[PDB]
Amino acid sequence: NNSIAIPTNFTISVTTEILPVSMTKTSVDCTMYICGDSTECSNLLLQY
């Protein structure tokens, strides 16, 4: 009812928080991935 705990000292604490802000920007070549060097495959993929 009448007890209080009072700090008589202190600690200066340095902690780390690590936050991702960006990820790798990636580009994909449609034809070169689906039809690497097949011109016929590229022509077929044109329809899709």
Partner: protein, 97 residues
């Protein structure tokens, strides 16, 4: 007949051309057709090994049927093209990346 590429004893009547390296060419090695730059390769092939594959099961090294020389196959240079424009209202000049 077994079609998976290997040292091919039996081949069709095709007249071989000269082997040209360090240039982007269409190539046909024992029925294996592709487009790329053929270059000298340091890969050491065992006698039964006639070509090499990468992690995508794409032929990245081949052995010449005549000279038994290992050749690395690199895709012909490619990339994206980006057009930097000030705006057609401002100007018709562009830059290409």
């Amino acid at each position: 007949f077994e079609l998976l590429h290997a040292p091919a004893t039996v081949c069709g009547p095709k007249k071989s051309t000269n082997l040209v390296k360090n240039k982007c060419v269409n190539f046909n090695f024992n029925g294996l057709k592709g487009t790329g730059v053929l270059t000298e390769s340091n890969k050491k092939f065992l006698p039964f090994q006639q070509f090499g594959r990468d992690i995508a099961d794409t032929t990245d090294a081949v052995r010449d049927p005549q000279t038994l020389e290992i050749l690395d196959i690199t895709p012909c240079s490619f990339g994206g093209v980006s057009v930097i424009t000030p705006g057609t209202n401002t100007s018709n000049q562009v830059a290409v990346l």
